Amino acid sequence: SPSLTSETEWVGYPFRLFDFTACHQSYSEMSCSYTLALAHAVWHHSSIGQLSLIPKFLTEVLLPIVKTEFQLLYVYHLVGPFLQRFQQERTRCMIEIGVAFYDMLLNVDQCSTHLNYMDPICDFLYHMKYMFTGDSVKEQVEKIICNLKPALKLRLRFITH
Amino acid sequence: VNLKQAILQAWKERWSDYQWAINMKKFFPKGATWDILNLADALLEQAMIGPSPNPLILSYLKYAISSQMVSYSSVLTAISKFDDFSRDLCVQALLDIMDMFCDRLSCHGKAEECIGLCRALLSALHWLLRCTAASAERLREGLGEKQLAMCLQRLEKTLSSTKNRALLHIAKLEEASSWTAIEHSLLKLGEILANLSNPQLRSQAEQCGTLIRSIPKTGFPTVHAVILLEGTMNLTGETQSLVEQLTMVKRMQHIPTPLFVLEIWKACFVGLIESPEGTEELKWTAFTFLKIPQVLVKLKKYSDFTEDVNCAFEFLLKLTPLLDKADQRCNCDCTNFLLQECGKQG
Amino acid sequence: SIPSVLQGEVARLDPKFLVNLDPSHCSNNGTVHLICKLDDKDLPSVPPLELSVPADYPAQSPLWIDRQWQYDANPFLQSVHRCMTSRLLQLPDKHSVTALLNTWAQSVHQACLSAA
Lengths: 161, 346, 116
Known about the structure:
The structure is cut from a larger assembly and holds chains A, B and C. Chain A is built from ten helices and no strands. By secondary structure, chain A is mostly helical. Chain C contains three helices and four strands; from the N terminus they run H-E-E-E-E-H-H. In chain C, the strands form two sheets. In chain C, strands 1-2 form a two-stranded antiparallel ribbon. Chains in contact: A-B, B-C. At the B-C interface, helix 2 and helix 3 of B face loops of C. Chain A: This is Mediator of RNA polymerase II transcription subunit 23. Chain A: Belongs to the Mediator complex subunit 23 family. Chain A: It is found in: Nucleus.
């Protein structure tokens, strides 16, 4: 949407825009206010047979669409809690999501000037390494770390450990 | 028997510190902290006669500052009356005097001692302005000449700490017609070094100048309640109570003015749509339509207010579903009517 | 107010010391600090020095403040500091303030004889 990629008028806290719990207030600001909530619902109702179509569609269709800072947090919210729903049901989801996240990590790094939410993103990386993915994707992560900015490369030595 | 006689007979042979102190102690039954008796007046008198200053007087002044013999204000009073500005070597020596005992100024005494310290630093900065004006005109008449580059190095370290700024500002208020000569030389200070243009000296020099004129994220639904309470029942008052409420709210919590106008308009829309049907719908729509230009005209009068509301509307024109729900009740486009109302208000 | 231990202590202290309380720091509390004044025609001027004694002064080992840059600009003062670090490090435990005061007093002559 141009409200995502082009209209970047909102510079402050974006996580309030990625939750329908904030829409308890008169806080419908976008179509994306609703589409996440059904994404909260439908994928909760979806079994692993329905959920298995999601990662291929993300890694093939929705992969080069993320261009602004908002789409990055939008696709991180798109997988975040449901990773637990992915966790018990499919190890292919762990392999594909480690490969996919570390693929678009360099993709957004190639096409960024300044991003300010690297601290919660690195905390999420720590969380998924320690809780979600373990160390399934390790070797290619080193090469992708070698492709990062040195300031971005600094805070993932423990990821390399 | 004189102090001048005493420093003279100390000068005639070579004495080190310990025997000199022993002689000074046996001479006077009363110490009198060696300052109210004015010891330091003749200490700088005989050290400036020669073009090359003697090291004996410098070694004499070394230990007295390090010990409790000579205080810090007495050196400043003597150097502040140095005037002349004739030779470069004694100016460099005066700069080297400033290198150790200054920047602390720990006054352990009475309140009058601190008042004297404040006026001493006032006259000292006046002498700093005078000596830098002399060192700048020396370079101006010369054309490396790093003498002014070290005078500004002296200048920047005399104002780095916050206590220097506090002392200068608290001495500014207590004294009248004293800071006038400060800007009388400051008007020349900027322009002389602007004539001698440098790639980097101007930045730090005018940073110290701006300091010496300096001596004299998160959504906030708090104001949502402020706007919403007024139109509930106490909407029959004047236009100034709500103004002195909401403008003061911006004082308490850091609020961007585009965010302020964003809240101003979204509250007007919410009070329109979320009002239930009946006489309360009409009352709320009238409240959101007829008192919001009155406060904004006064805000424009008291305040830049044209540019920020454009970004406020840039924020505002994204709320599609909530404000589209208002158009079901209103059966029409309220945006046209309100953006002609703003033009009617000018 | 002040305990009687220090009141009996200062009764037979040398008149060549004029030690008084520190103007800074807290007051009427367990820890006390006493800044010393030396008025001797024999000895030259030195920094006045300041101690530190906690509550229950008997049966404890007190301390002394540290300021290395005050004894600079002269190697004589550095020798005074080195003599302080020499004499005070062999002082026995739980000693009174007379021992530290007198070891501070004698080191001035011990450095003056080397200086002269």
